[PDB]
Amino acid sequence: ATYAQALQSVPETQVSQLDNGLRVASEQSSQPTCTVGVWIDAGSRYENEKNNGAGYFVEHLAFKGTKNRPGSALEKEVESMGAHLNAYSTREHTAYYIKALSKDLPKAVELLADIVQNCSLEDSQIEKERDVILQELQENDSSMRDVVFDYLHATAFQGTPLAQSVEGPSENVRKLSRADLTEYVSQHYKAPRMVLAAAGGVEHRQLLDLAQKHFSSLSGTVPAFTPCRFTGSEIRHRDDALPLAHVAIAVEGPGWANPDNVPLQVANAIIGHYDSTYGGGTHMSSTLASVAATRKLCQSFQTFNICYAETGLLGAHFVCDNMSIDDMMFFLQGQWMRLCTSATESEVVRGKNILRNALVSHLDGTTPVCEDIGRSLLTYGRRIPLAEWESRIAEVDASVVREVCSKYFYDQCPAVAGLGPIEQLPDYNRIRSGMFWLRF
Amino acid sequence: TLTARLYSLLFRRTSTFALTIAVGALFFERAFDQGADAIYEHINQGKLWKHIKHKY
Amino acid sequence: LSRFLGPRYRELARNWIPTASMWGAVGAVGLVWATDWRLILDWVPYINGKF
Amino acid sequence: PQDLEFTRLPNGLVIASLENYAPASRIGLFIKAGSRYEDSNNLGTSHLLRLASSLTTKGASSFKITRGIEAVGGKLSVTSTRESMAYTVECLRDDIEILMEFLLNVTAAPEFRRWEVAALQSQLRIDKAVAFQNPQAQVLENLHAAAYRNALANSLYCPDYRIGKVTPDQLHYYVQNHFTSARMALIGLGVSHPVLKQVAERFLNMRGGLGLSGAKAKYRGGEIRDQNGDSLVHAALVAESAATGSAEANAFSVLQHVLGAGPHVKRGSNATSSLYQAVAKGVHQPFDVSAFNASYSDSGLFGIYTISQAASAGDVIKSAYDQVKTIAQGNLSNTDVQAAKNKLKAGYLMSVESSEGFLDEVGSQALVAGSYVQPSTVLQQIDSVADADVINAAKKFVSGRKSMAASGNLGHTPFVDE
Amino acid sequence: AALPATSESPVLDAKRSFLCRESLSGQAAGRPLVASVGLNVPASVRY
Amino acid sequence: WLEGIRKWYYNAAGFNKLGLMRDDTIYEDDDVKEAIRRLPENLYNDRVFRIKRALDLTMRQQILPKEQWTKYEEDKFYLEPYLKEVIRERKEREEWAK
Amino acid sequence: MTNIRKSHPLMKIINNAFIDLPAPSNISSWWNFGSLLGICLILQILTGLFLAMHY
């Protein structure tokens, strides 16, 4: 194959639906292991200030027992077959999945339906998980990146439910009752909002029969989603006891289904990423990475394209000592401007190659493919094939990158989060002025 | 809106912002001097040389 | 020069040509305005009345 | 998707290729060149060598390698264990020739320029400090230092005193003595076998021999304790178990999954872990416990790793060790061993799902054994393991001399003798 | 490479604390540690 | 003969009267700075003392005795290969930049 | 790479005096009269020099 025949030879995601509206999607291989999961259109952005944290609490109680499998029994079953049960929650999505052997798919599927359908939500377990969730909140406080991105979401989407954190404030953790959680599950764990994905040695017809045997009870065939205003704003938490400062800056980027995402991702690949444990250092094609390695300006920087249904965070996060924040801002915004006005074809080619490599390398293993299927059916209503992603990347050039980075970056108000010894984090007006060029 | 159109067409780029400022400075000098002069010669009507020169 | 030339630098030239010509028009208009150069100003309709 | 093609050349080099027709290709050169081949005079040489890819080679400058691998979106990674070094290039299947020329320049024609080498000593400190931000890195380093006298006693990281002193001559001598053909295996996922043969022909003709014959690892049975006050205490207590690829090694794998070898369920309770249940019977403080298995070509380490509160360290360790002794006393059901076998087999099959995992398995197999065996044979070897083999292994651990490494506030941590 | 890495590497930065048994679960080591470096990737260690 | 002219010019240039080699007299731009930074330490120290002695000599408006003058056939172009490699790297970066 | 505003020896002085100078956030209109004084000085030099062209 020539990577054009290899893309054309990738197995096809097969999608069906139950009468209740539960979608069933699978990518089959010849591997002897599979990943099967449920992805739900439920998150913190669906929570208000009183219920905020309920979804994380329900994820916490997910494996602690159902009416059929009390307490540890479920875990025992999973552990007794060599399978791995995992879960996660975001501001928009929730997922419960099993990594099992291909011959364990029936039981795995059964284990999932029970988990999403019949969680006990027992009050004793609710108190134990209350204690656990409080300790995990204090554990999350120690992670400067998690805090700085929660801050970025809180100031960018202030007044909206997208500013909410996934876990909610600790006061809600202490106040959430069983009635709160049962209401959350009854309003958000619905078949039309769920996707049963499976990647690996899984036949779609057999998975569909399993879903019709285990999920057909679910809601047949309503509060959901209001848009979230973006705000140019800054939140600076100064703690000079912290050794390194974290700075996250983002403009309003596109939502999930916007084609602008493909050129913008290309542009982010042009800026790239860095940390001080890199081989390439000063020789890196990314200008910011080479300046950061030559001057030791930062410990790391990453570009990001966070997407929600209708908006997102397009920007960069960097970590540096107190005396270099300013420099890190100057060279980062400059790169943004250099892309808006003078993108240049060869680095667009490099960024396109980086994006194709990221997309292909990410989908390695049954679990990434299962997540791709579930999250893709939630965000696009479809699994976009890699051949299509390649078609969209192939139609990117320096004119396209210049135009889209102009549309999203140039002369736009960013949202800014600073955490730590951030006295040298530039004043908001100085950053905002760094978002345009007078020469241009 | 009108100001959205003005920003999108004339203000977003600094070169075009500056060109708008230059053309506006030219036309503003003309119109502002014309108006201020008319005001001054109305306040002082008949008193100035221009008003009375045509007799000499 | 040798360190210059090449496709990337010609592409940068093409990219910045609109901005350069726009600043050229800015300097042109500003110079016409500051020195009241009638050689051009006599053709601008309303400004024509100033002479 | 074709079948794995495995051949061994007259120079002793192994080449194995599987063309899966995946859009990306991954090429790994696996070498018997871990830190177990260092001696007391060149400690840290192989750590700097791990950091030394992307330096100038005879066929490409440092700038050329960095820029030309990033141009195609490619990846160049070096992963070391105590016994092996794997150099992997991963990119799209249309750009594999460029990456393979880069990889072959990196491994077969390194220049180790004195100024580039002296400008790389700082990443020894950076790299080791980043690794030592995990409390287990230094505990495992100390466990190997205290379990062995010479060879596996060597750290994967450079000694602090050796930083800024690893010379280019040490790197050149190291490559000249360990990067030889009969110590190398080129394994390509997503490539054709004749392509890998042509690649292995254009280079990789250093000596076609066995290089420097490293020493046999000598069991020490010592104890290293690192008081550093950390809120938690990390303790590792092991005995010598068996070398990789044997019936005893498989019994030790089954015993690791009987005792408990990591969590299956997120935020669970580790219900099927007998060690975890033994510790949670009496220890009501936050803790973790697992069985630890470290198999190597000429030896192995089997034991217990515990993380606990400083105050409850002794109770956790005694609880875990006594559970192991109870298994050594013949208390082990058939259902628990069936469950352990299921865990082990599922974990093995899940490890090779990714291209990285499958490549690593094929590379280590080609180095250690010089032959590839399909997962079905691996699984039936797991099946063959009997109950008495597990009971044994546990007996051998209990009756075996112990090496221990702990870190944290150790005022309540026991010694190997108490 | 093209992908950023599950974890970027700040030296001289406290990483994360573990306060619960649920978080502590999985942090015990079971296999020998490997060390990985990369041209354009965060360095990793595994146990 | 080209070498007659070359040895004549080497005598007439007169940095050999100060004990200097040709590479000691090179104007130090950025390429030459990196080339000097890449020298082995013994050659660097020889260069430093030679140059310090020549500065000390010109401070007195003096030259060395003719026996101590650098002979034309014994001038070591010690800095030439490092400079050529530095310049090759710069040229490669520029070729990439186009 | 550098920001010439911070690295250039003249622009470094200018930058530290009037651009990146840390100033109290609450100084009132009464703190304006420094900049007025220096402006008055310049005006006096400007008009006086033009007076000195004829005086």
Ligand code: HEM
């Ligand atoms: C410190 C700044 C200055 C101050 C405070 C100042 C003050 C004065 C004053 C009060 C007068 C008398 C004005 C009047 O006629 O009523 C004057 C006159 C004059 N000054 Fe200055 N001056 C200053 C700077 C300068 C400079 C720098 C020059 C020359 C370059 C200058 C040239 C003159 C001239 C020529 C006159 C006489 C013309 C006249 O009377 O208007 N001045 N100055």
